[PDB]
């Protein structure tokens, strides 16, 4: 429809793409996980596979508009390729992440963006003890691959992983699942890198 | 030939692409499933693999034309990349869906589109009981990834999955297969959501 | 060299792309299979894997030229991406077909095209009996995914599959292999649908 | 640097790409194999996997230049996608060939090109006897997919496969490995076809 | 923001891309490995799989700028596709390397670049003795595919692999891991090639 076509043209066809954040114009990315299932455990290679929805949110001044100028449109959906997205990645995957959903974002008129890719991830975890009452704990950090906390500030809205969509007939019972922001300085370099530590304790049903 | 070339140039090369539905101009997408086989059952990971044809229908005003101005052309085939297509996806897949057919659609002069991707899907299902007389029931929801019921309404022409192409020498006997529209709210979000729930009850033949 | 560059420019750069066949301007695609090996039999999932060359031939008026105008060039080779190709698809594959050869076609001055992709196909087949003297029969239909017989007709040059390149040390002996044009009529629709049925009867050697 | 940028611009931006060889202007491609390892043997499917470097060499008038006109530049490297490359392919692979290295060619001022991709190939071979003192022989032919001997002639610099890079701790001992030009006529076609027959005799070490 | 947009436009949009190093203008690439885990050992195929970060650094005059002309910007992140990158490859992989991180690099105003792809690599290694106290040693060389030491030289900052991020619950104990620059004259080629030899001695923990 007319007004939305006009809006997208104005936002995407008139200016160079947003080049990403810098120290002088940093960006906060909010990150949250919805765990769907632990789909595989391999005790011979120490690899565990998760399926989850990863919710990312950020806000750009360059994506703002006045709804009155565009037929009262307050938000729209658009391919994630049309916009800048943050390079948030798992620090200890063992295979390329697999994307399970369309790559499409929702942009709201205040310039906020929501992008929630469904993914299957293989990561490093020794599952020894998963077949016991105590279960086993695995952990994987997510964070920007090359932006420091001076450019991208990561945060969470809550430290509790969302389990309301966890598969009811999973081989595994989730004992706990938290997602915790950490600020780390690595030996080589003075700038902080932010991560969100996904920590899941589980056992066989 | 010349008339079809002209029609496609007018439909596709003269205006911005359709930007997708909105709350003001919502769209109805009709879904239908043709189940071909249950090709894998994994009781160690609770994953089941299906091969099916997914029929999708919708109608756009911007794809309409008068056959009289285009040599009586009443419909045409065109690459799916030339047109907007709905972001219908399975909500509980465990691996990227694999497409088995050419991505080509049929567009009719009244603006209606028919697109029928053949797919192999791995999804979450505990198959315990499949080797019994009672069998086992699996279920997977399909719906838009990013549009709520505000923008995309879904429906089925029938609640019965088409089994007329089900592989006659399958490992599995289909006891029942239904495709039902559901309306649902999620704790994550304020909008009504619409999905089509594919429910298949089956046993080893 | 110069004449061939000029010809390709005239054929591909100077006109809109051919929009494919229609009822008014139908096409005939000739199909022929060269079976190289039956490379896998899976009796747990009822899947069988074939490697073969699939020969496709058709003719377009828009690909004709007078050799006298182009230095006696009578044919040329070019990327299949440069030309329209028919959407011939296996109707019962269980995985995306894998292409084993370069996608390059031969175009002749009468407008005729020859394209012969080598492929690995997994398709639905219960191989029970393969280890017996009588062997087992598998079948898979190939046809246009989106076109009816009103736009694309199919034929074979011979109903006998070419076994002259069948792997001499294969695990399997081919007892018979045929490729037969078939017509399918559906209650819903006046237009006939065409396929070529590849039927292979085989046993362990 | 400046001189090289100018040369590449002159070679690749001012003329349409070379349209490949023809009967009038045929091309000789020289082929050589460097076998690194036999990395899998499957006696249940009769498939063997090789890892090797495949050296291809040819020469094009259109790639020539006077080094005196370009700052004494005598050769340069560029992405293989920048230039025409021959459609040399294994005739009996069972899976798409996997490329293990960058795809970059070396171009020399006399118009000669050298391109040496590292590859992993699965191909048809019954390995029965590999565990014996006699070993087993496998063979796979390589040649143009669409060009006859009238357009592309193949040759080797030597009949002996290069084993100087063969993995010192391979599971397999190479007893002989040859690469031999063959001219063949096929019933399918009236003109001669050229292949290089890679023949490897090996046993478990 | 505005200044970064201008910088990228000036660096990338205003001039031809860097055509890579030459004998007249050679380059030095610094390599460092951070070994995260030995994720698979296959004694039937002699293949071992590593997961590591590979840090690459180089410097280009054409990537320099004066921060005073660009709002004090001293560095920026950009897609690796925007810049030239060196063709550093493992010389003995058995499968295509899998990239685990976004392909993005950091460019600094002196023209230096830092690119750190995380990767999973399968490579040739007979792991016999891995299950002993002595352990086993594997090695894989990394170097330019097409540039000799006269065009691309390599160096490490240290000959010790960074083991600070090695998975604490790995199946394998690392006995030693070094990364050493080597110069090699291969019988195939008159100019020597430089590699960094990654040598890992390990055993089951
Ligand atoms: O020193 C490190 C190790 C640490 O490893 C976890 C993952 C990280 C994500 N990216 C990958 C490269 C890295 C980085 C950038 C600049 C200097 C050092 C450095 N790294 C990793 C680091 C974090 C942050 C960043
Ligand atoms: O937490 C959820 C689960 C629910 O799953 C079914 C599919 C949905 C379609 N889209 C996919 C992403 C989702 C959504 C957005 C923001 C936070 C959580 C979230 N999801 C899914 C949700 C619905 C609605 C929406
Ligand atoms: O009734 C069918 C089933 C059959 O399935 C195999 C594949 C086919 C390729 N396309 C997909 C849609 C289809 C078709 C068109 C019109 C009415 C029925 C109908 N189909 C499939 C059919 C063939 C032909 C065609
Ligand atoms: O236009 C179509 C194509 C599609 O093909 C897959 C199978 C289907 C199952 N049945 C077979 C006939 C069909 C149908 C009925 C009425 C008009 C069109 C039409 N078809 C197929 C269709 C689905 C649904 C239905
Ligand atoms: O019937 C054949 C088999 C033979 O197989 C080996 C490889 C060849 C290289 N290309 C691949 C396609 C082929 C060809 C073209 C047209 C009709 C049949 C046909 N083929 C192969 C043939 C040769 C020559 C040519
Ligand atoms: O024969 C070889 C083996 C050697 O292997 C290690 C890596 C090298 C880097 N590039 C990759 C291709 C190679 C080369 C070019 C032309 C003929 C043979 C050939 N190779 C490798 C060689 C070096 C140099 C060069």
Numbering used by the authors:
A (entry chain B), B (entry chain A), C (entry chain E), D (entry chain D), E (entry chain C): 1 to 205
Sentences from the paper on this structure:
Cys-loop receptors are a class of pentameric ligand-gated ion channels that are activated by specific neurotransmitters, including acetylcholine (ACh), serotonin (5-HT), glycine (Gly), and γ-aminobutyric acid (GABA). Using X-ray crystallography we solved 3-dimensional structures of strychnine or d-tubocurarine in complex with ACh binding protein (AChBP), a well-recognized structural homolog of the nicotinic ACh receptor.
The affinity of strychnine for Ac-AChBP (Ki = 38.0±3.3 nM) is more than 100-fold higher than for α7 nAChR (Ki = 4,854±133 nM) and is actually close to the high affinity of strychnine reported for the α1 GlyR (Ki = 16±2 nM). Inspection of simple difference electron density unambiguously revealed the ligand orientation in all five binding sites of the pentamer. Remarkably, one of the two C loops involved in forming a crystal contact is in a more extended conformation and reveals electron density for a second strychnine molecule in the same binding site. The first strychnine molecule, which contacts the (+) face, is pivoted by 48° around the N-atom relative to the strychnine molecule in all other four binding sites (single occupancy in yellow and double occupancy in magenta). The second strychnine molecule, which contacts the (−) face, is stacked onto the first molecule in a mirrored upside-down orientation and both molecules are separated by a distance of 3.6 Å. In the binding site with double occupancy, the tip of loop C is displaced outward by a distance of 5.6 Å relative to the binding sites with single occupancy. First, strychnine forms contacts with the following residues on the (+) face: Y91, S144, W145, C188, C189, Y193 and (−) face: Y53, Q55, M114, I116, D162, S165. Because the C-loop interacting with 2 strychnine molecules also interfaces with a C-loop from a neighboring pentamer the double strychnine occupancy might be the result of a crystal contact.
